[PDB]
């Protein structure tokens, strides 16, 4: 094919402590390279590479422009925040948790345990592993947070132990969708 | 920062295609179908809660397009460097034989933002009930894209996610099968 030329624009709004503090970033990119941007923290335009130097100089001489972009944290950021909050910031879907053994080898051998937590939102989530009540802090490996691209996350957390008859293994998930932590037990 | 909202748009030559969308913590709130000039919500629900004047996106694209023409000249017409995508396949939830599930094809870290994605099941390409998302932003200014294939777990049927990207040496296939 023929060479592609790309123009990227990103209007970013960063919120902390509700809307107590807001940061607005208007960034211009050409072929994966940001050359000029507006940072509400600076107040005016700036270049990120030489091609922007001339641009910034021009724009920053238009008082009406800077004036307008400085209000963006309010008219744009804090406004949009109020329009979507109820279904994004507040969005909460409870985690679906299941446990099961992985790998495969006869009695008195290798074995792993799996805790599959999925379909939750937000992503901030905590998962632990207990054995007969004691918390396990050794043979645990996690996939880490995993986006699903449909407003839901999923995570897989494994624990390597040698299952003994009569034992009780528990997976504990703490998340914003539940007042009290969820638990799923597996009995050996 | 507890939350981040991003209005991300782009124009590409010579394909002459552009996109406009909103991102909330890595998720797509909505995007505008430049063709039909219609606001498209990631979740059918959001529609009832908020509203977006599609025309707003069109006007913006016009701006991006104009800067591209100028920036493209004042940069001795240097092309963009293709960056091949990393692909990953995963199920919506733990797979249970004959229990509705979903295959997820996550294409990440690629640019320019152009890709041909197809779902293969035992070789033959499927298109029944498939779905996808426009291109999503990244910290590094690369792109992410999701494709969904609703299916039915079975011991036979095998599945593939095919990704054609000018950065690849040939179509990339990430395999998935039940054990």
């Amino acid at each position: 094919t023929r060479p592609r030329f790309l123009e990227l624009l990103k209007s970013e709004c960063h919120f902390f402590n509700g809307t107590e503090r807001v940061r607005f970033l208007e960034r211009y990119f050409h072929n994966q390279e940001e050359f000029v941007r507006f940072d509400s923290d600076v107040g005016e335009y700036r270049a990120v590479t030489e091609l922007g130097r001339p641009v910034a100089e021009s724009w920053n001489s238009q008082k009406d422009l800077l004036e307008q972009k400085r209000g963006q944290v309010d008219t744009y950021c804090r406004h949009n925040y109020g329009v979507v909050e109820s279904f994004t910031v507040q969005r909460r879907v409870h985690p679906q948790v299941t446990v099961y053994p992985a790998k495969t080898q006869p009695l008195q051998h290798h074995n792993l345990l799996v805790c599959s937590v999925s379909g939750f939102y937000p992503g901030s989530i905590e998962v632990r592993w207990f054995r007969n009540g004691q918390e396990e802090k050794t043979g645990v490996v996690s996939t880490g947070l995993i986006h699903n691209g449909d407003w839901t996350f999923q995570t897989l957390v494994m624990l390597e132990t040698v299952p003994r008859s009569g034992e009780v293994y528990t997976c504990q998930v703490e998340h914003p969708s539940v007042t009290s932590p969820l638990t799923v037990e597996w009995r050996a | 920062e507890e939350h981040v909202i991003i209005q991300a748009e782009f124009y590409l030559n010579p394909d002459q295609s552009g996109e406009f969308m909103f991102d909330f913590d890595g998720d797509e709130i909505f995007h505008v179908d430049m063709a039909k000039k219609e606001t498209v919500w990631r979740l059918e629900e959001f529609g009832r809660f908020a509203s977006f004047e599609a025309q707003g996106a069109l006007a913006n694209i016009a701006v991006d397009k104009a800067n591209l023409e100028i920036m493209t000249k004042r940069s001795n017409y240097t092309p963009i460097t293709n960056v091949p995508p990393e692909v990953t396949v995963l199920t919506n939830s733990p797979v249970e034989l004959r229990e509705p599930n979903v295959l997820i094809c996550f294409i990440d870290k690629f640019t320019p933002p152009v890709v041909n994605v197809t779902w293969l099941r035992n070789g033959k390409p499927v298109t029944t009930g498939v779905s996808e998302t426009v291109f999503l932003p990244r910290e590094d200014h690369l792109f992410r894209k999701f494709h969904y294939l609703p299916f039915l777990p079975s011991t036979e049927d095998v599945y593939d996610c095919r990704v054609e990207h000018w950065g690849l040496d040939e179509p990339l296939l990430k395999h998935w099968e039940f054990d």
Binding site: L65 | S51, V63, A66
Partner: peptide
Amino acid sequence: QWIRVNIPKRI
């Protein structure tokens, strides 16, 4: 009710 767009500057 309405999500507002941030209109960029022309170079």
